[PDB]
């Protein structure tokens, strides 16, 4: 495989230093630019999947059981518990 531009990110995937050439200027990741590329709303997180926010309604968390449930809002990298 190509050279890990920025070393295989050990916790990024868009954050920076993607390293993994599979994303180095392609998979919404900048391994040569230490950052995420256009189209990527979020590098990663509760409301971050692939290259966009987890469409509102995507349960990312939940307190204990099922009352309000934690759901994404498709407008942020965070998923509110709805509490």
Curated annotation (Swiss-Prot):
Similarity remark: Belongs to the venom metalloproteinase (M12B) family. P-II subfamily. P-IIa sub-subfamily.
Processing after translation: Exists in 3 forms in the venom. The forms A, B, and C are present at 53%, 32% and 15%. The forms A and B differ by their disulfide bond pattern in the N-terminal part. No information is known about form C.
Intracellular or extracellular location(s): Secreted
PROSITE patterns documented for this protein: DISINTEGRIN_1, DISINTEGRIN_2
Keyword tags: Cell adhesion impairing toxin, Disulfide bond, Hemostasis impairing toxin, Platelet aggregation inhibiting toxin, Secreted, Toxin
Name of the protein in question: Disintegrin bitistatin
Miscellaneous: The disintegrin belongs to the long disintegrin subfamily.
GO cellular component, one term: extracellular region
Motif segment (Cell attachment site): 64-66
Keyword match Disulfide bond: yes
Protein function: Inhibits fibrinogen interaction with platelets. Acts by binding to alpha-IIb/beta-3 (ITGA2B/ITGB3) on the platelet surface and inhibits aggregation induced by ADP, thrombin, platelet-activating factor and collagen.
InterPro entries in the cross-refs: Disintegrin_CS, Disintegrin_dom, Disintegrin_dom_sf
Complex formation: Monomer.
Domain Disintegrin: 2-83
Known tissue expression: Expressed by the venom gland.
Gene Ontology MF terms in the entry: toxin activity
Keyword Hydrolase listed: no
Disulfide bonds: 5-24, 5-34, 16-29, 16-34, 18-24, 18-29, 28-51, 42-48, 47-72, 60-79
């Amino acid at each position: 495989s190509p050279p890990v531009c920025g070393n295989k990110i050990l916790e990024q995937g868009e954050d920076c230093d993607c390293g993994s050439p599979a994303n180095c200027q392609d998979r919404c990741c900048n391994a040569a630019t230490c950052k995420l590329t256009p189209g990527s709303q979020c590098n990663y997180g509760e409301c971050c999947d692939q290259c966009r926010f987890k469409k509102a309604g995507t349960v990312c968390r939940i307190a204990r059981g099922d009352w309000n449930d934690d759901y994404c809002t498709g407008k942020s990298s965070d998923c509110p518990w709805n509490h």
